[PDB]
Amino acid sequence: PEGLCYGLFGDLAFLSVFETMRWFVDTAERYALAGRPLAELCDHNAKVARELGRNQVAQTWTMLRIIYCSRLPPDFFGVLVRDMLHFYAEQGDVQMAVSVLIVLGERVRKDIDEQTQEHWYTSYIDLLQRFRLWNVSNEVVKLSTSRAVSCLNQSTTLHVNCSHCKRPMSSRGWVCDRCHRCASMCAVCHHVVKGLFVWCQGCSHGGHLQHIMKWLEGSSHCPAGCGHLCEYS
Amino acid sequence: IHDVSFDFHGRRMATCSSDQSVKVWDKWHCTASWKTHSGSVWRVTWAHPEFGQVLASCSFDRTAAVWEEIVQSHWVKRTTLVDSRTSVTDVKFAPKHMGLMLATCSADGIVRIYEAPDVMNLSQWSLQHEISCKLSCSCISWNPSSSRAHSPMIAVGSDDNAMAKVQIFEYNENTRKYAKAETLMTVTDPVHDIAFAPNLGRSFHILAIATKDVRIFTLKPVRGPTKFEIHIVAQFDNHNSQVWRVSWNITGTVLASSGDDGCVRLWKANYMDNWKCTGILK
Amino acid sequence: FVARSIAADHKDLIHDVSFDFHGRRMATCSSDQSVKVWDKGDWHCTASWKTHSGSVWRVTWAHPEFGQVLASCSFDRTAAVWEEISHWVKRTTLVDSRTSVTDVKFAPKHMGLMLATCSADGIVRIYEAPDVMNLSQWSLQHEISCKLSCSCISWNPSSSRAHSPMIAVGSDKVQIFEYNENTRKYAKAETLMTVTDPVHDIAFAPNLGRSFHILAIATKDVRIFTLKPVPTKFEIHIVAQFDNHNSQVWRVSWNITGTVLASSGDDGCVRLWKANNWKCTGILKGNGS
Ligand SMILES: [Zn+2]
Ligand SMILES: [Zn+2]
Ligand SMILES: [Zn+2]
């Protein structure tokens, strides 16, 4: 006669609407995982952690910067870093472990078995997708040290056919071979859409993503002029 | 209201009651209230969004139904699972890492597990395995571990003779069939609900059991089903009554427990692995 | 018609100036063999490079549909074709000519990206790129022999199905050539017997749906010819003959709608002629007065 269920945003239900995890979202939002040297990455991550209030996380980032981005034996700290990663993982804090794996790179990947690494990666990806954070999830997938996770970002290839000929186009060109005409004509500014080309399933029309976004903000008809109620107003 | 379940994203709920209605609330105006079953609906659960807005409902009419939202926003009845000769107690989708797999437990002691070969066609399901628990099943809980080191594992809790009321079954790669893996002889009180804690990087599986008290086990996988070092770590008797439902944190750290007293309380463990109550709600 | 100097600084004398289709981008071929590009409430230079060994006479843009493509005739018998990647990169060089390339003007985009060059030897070549995605290849197809010293060319901006491709050729007298689908080869179409003085600029006009083409000739006196179709025969008629320049006219250019004609002569005066009958609408000078 009783039903209990906990929620994703910390909400508790039993109908009870008990509100009763913004730190995880913020850390995912402003960690830096690539494109910068190890020292800069660790310093930025520690600054973010200290600003949020996780003192131990910032201390861990700075300690990693001391340990790696510098005599003691080269492999004297490998067991320590592996133990720190396992301690973060076992307590349910997966974002820190995955971020350390991304930032350190191959310097620590060999110290952890592929099964546990993939488990951590999948858990963090599931958590990120749960909070509707696609950007950080895709960044983790792309930077993943495990090939299995990196391959999870690839039936993501769309096939395009020119309408004037009903034939396939080359996977690297914007010019139709048969019709000899640009089938990627922009539907607003009338140029060549070499990059992002937003499409409509109904009227099969589209153009520059920014142009279409700006056009739909002031009207509801397809800019190509077909009458298809694309946004239905 | 017999059960409430949040969706994957935590923005929608599915509430089923004895009024022959299953309601879906969106962040909370009920966008759809439709009659589902010929009997009272016990549990309704959500599925991973990669398969779409999919609901599973088990009822007293010996049938388990799978619902899907289609575009206003109307819910359709994708499939009926009439394999059960008696009432179906609990139904739970498997974790997304195993694909679209459904498991139902019947009051006759048979746990039936289904799977749709094509995730794009929910109208078809196949009874991949059937497990006999030799006792009246009450609730089941899948193991949400996404690690490749843990085989797909399902635990069945019976509310049935002072025998073990909790059976844990594990997938065997060679035999390609579930089999008994762990039997909790220490749990002889009737079991009303079980809920595995989300793994989320942990090296061991944490099991929460609903009984006359609240019990938490850490089924550590020791190095044929894999043996476990089963050891209860939290015997909470703050309820002073029977336990109905148990729900875990979204990170598998805080266990929400609800008893017959009408009070919902949360349990978390410090760094000594000493579980303690972190709040009382009512 | 208020004239105001644009905030642009050039270290060398500019020979030719060409706008873009939108009117934002522009190109100039300065006296130091430098092809510059400016961008748009002021003008900001974005590119400048040396192109050839000799002087660059005329520079003109292509249609933006194929991309930011520039052409430049030179004295080294070369007409380089440039592309924008802002790092402008030369795509090809059309050195098939034997004498100085007097002028180069891009063809209308209604028939693809084509290119024509008039050589001082009296032969006009025509280049086309079958693959728009790869501008590094340009196959010569038509070798129009004018039998006279070519001075300028101008394509026909007409894009209707009833009008064949059309190229004007001057001399330094006016010979107009039209494409013939029956023979699949360019030939002679018409000749302006009324033109005897040397020509320094020949320019068609944007038809904008007219039933006839308009030709403007730069000579000792500005002449406007209305070519009315009836090779397709033409009713060549002269509708204007202005001696206001009192000197040889060097440049002629039409507006986007083909209604007002600009003529710049040796008198240092830019004169705008508009239909009313054609009469002057504004006399300019070097300082803009
Ligand atoms: Zn085509
Ligand atoms: Zn555009
Ligand atoms: Zn459309």
From Swiss-Prot, chain A:
Binding site for Zn(2+) 1: C162, C165, C176, C179
Positions annotated to bind Zn(2+) 3: C200, C203, H228, C230
Residues that coordinate or bind Zn(2+) 2: C186, C189, H208, H211
Outcome of substituting M63E: Abolished interaction with WDR59 and assembly of the GATOR2 complex
Protein residues bound to Zn(2+) 4: H205, C222, C226
PTM: Autoubiquitinated; MIOS is required to prevent autoubiquitination.
Zinc finger boundaries on the chain: RING-type: 184-233
Zinc finger (C4-type): 161-183
Coiled-coil zones: none
Superkingdom: Eukaryota
Localization: Lysosome membrane
UniProt function note: Catalytic component of the GATOR2 complex, a multiprotein complex that acts as an activator of the amino acid-sensing branch of the mTORC1 signaling pathway. The GATOR2 complex indirectly activates mTORC1 through the inhibition of the GATOR1 subcomplex. GATOR2 probably acts as an E3 ubiquitin-protein ligase toward GATOR1. In the presence of abundant amino acids, the GATOR2 complex mediates ubiquitination of the NPRL2 core component of the GATOR1 complex, leading to GATOR1 inactivation. In the absence of amino acids, GATOR2 is inhibited, activating the GATOR1 complex.
SUBUNIT field: Component of the GATOR2 subcomplex, composed of MIOS, SEC13, SEH1L, WDR24 and WDR59. The GATOR2 complex interacts with CASTOR1 and CASTOR2; the interaction is negatively regulated by arginine. The GATOR2 complex interacts with SESN1, SESN2 and SESN3; the interaction is negatively regulated by amino acids. SESN1, SESN2 and SESN3 convey leucine availability via direct interaction with SEH1L and WDR24.
Family that this chain belongs to: Belongs to the WD repeat WDR24 family.
Protein name (database record): GATOR2 complex protein WDR24
Lineage, top ranks: Eukaryota, Metazoa, Chordata, Craniata, Vertebrata
Segment of the intact protein contained: 340 to 790 of 790
Curated annotation (Swiss-Prot), chain B:
Cellular compartment(s): Chromosome, Centromere, Kinetochore; Nucleus, Nuclear pore complex; Lysosome membrane
Major localization listed first in the record, in broad terms: nucleus
UniProt entry keywords in alphabetical sequence: Cell cycle, Cell division, Centromere, Chromosome, Chromosome partition, Isopeptide bond, Kinetochore, Lysosome, Membrane, Mitosis, mRNA transport, Nuclear pore complex, Nucleus, Phosphoprotein, Protein transport, Repeat, Translocation, Transport, Ubl conjugation, WD repeat
GO CC terms of this entry: cytosol; GATOR2 complex; kinetochore; lysosomal membrane; nuclear envelope; nuclear pore; nuclear pore outer ring; Seh1-associated complex
Molecular-function annotations in GO: structural molecule activity
Family: Belongs to the WD repeat SEC13 family.
Role of this protein: Component of the Nup107-160 subcomplex of the nuclear pore complex (NPC). The Nup107-160 subcomplex is required for the assembly of a functional NPC. The Nup107-160 subcomplex is also required for normal kinetochore microtubule attachment, mitotic progression and chromosome segregation. This subunit plays a role in recruitment of the Nup107-160 subcomplex to the kinetochore. As a component of the GATOR2 complex, functions as an activator of the amino acid-sensing branch of the mTORC1 signaling pathway. The GATOR2 complex indirectly activates mTORC1 through the inhibition of the GATOR1 subcomplex. GATOR2 probably acts as an E3 ubiquitin-protein ligase toward GATOR1. In the presence of abundant amino acids, the GATOR2 complex mediates ubiquitination of the NPRL2 core component of the GATOR1 complex, leading to GATOR1 inactivation. In the absence of amino acids, GATOR2 is inhibited, activating the GATOR1 complex.
Name of the protein described by the UniProt record: Nucleoporin SEH1
Native source organism of the sequence: Homo sapiens (Human)
Gene encoding the protein: SEH1L
UniProtKB/Swiss-Prot annotation, chain C:
Disulfide bonds listed in the record: none
Pfam families: WD40 (PF00400)
Ranges: WD repeats: 9-45, 51-85, 96-137, 145-187, 194-230, 244-280
Compartment annotation: Chromosome, Centromere, Kinetochore; Nucleus, Nuclear pore complex; Lysosome membrane
A GO cellular-component term linked to this record: nuclear envelope
Family: Belongs to the WD repeat SEC13 family.
Protein name: Nucleoporin SEH1
Source species of the chain: Homo sapiens
